[PDB]
Amino acid sequence: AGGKTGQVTVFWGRNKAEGSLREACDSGMYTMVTMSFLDVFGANGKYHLDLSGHDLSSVGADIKHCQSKGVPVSLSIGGYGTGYSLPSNRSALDLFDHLWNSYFGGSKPSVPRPFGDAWLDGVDLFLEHGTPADRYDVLALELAKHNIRGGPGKPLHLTATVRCGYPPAAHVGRALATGIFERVHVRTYESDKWCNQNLGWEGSWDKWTAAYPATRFYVGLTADDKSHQWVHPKNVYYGVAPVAQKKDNYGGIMLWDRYFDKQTNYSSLIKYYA
Amino acid sequence: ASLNDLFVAAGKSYFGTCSDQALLQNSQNEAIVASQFGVITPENSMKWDALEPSQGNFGWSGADYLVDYATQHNKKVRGHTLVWHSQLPSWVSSIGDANTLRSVMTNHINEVVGRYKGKIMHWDVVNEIFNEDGTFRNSVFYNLLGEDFVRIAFETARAADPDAKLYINDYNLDSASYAKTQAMASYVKKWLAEGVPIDGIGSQAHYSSSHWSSTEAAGALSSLANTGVSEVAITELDIAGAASSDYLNLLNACLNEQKCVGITVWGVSDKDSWRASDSPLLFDGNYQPKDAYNAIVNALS
Ligand SMILES: *[C@@H]1O[C@H](CO)[C@@H](O)[C@H](O)[C@H]1NC(C)=O
Ligand SMILES: *[C@@H]1O[C@H](CO)[C@@H](O)[C@H](O)[C@H]1NC(C)=O
Question: With an 8 Å Cβ cutoff, is A202 touching chain B?
Answer without folding.
Answer: yes
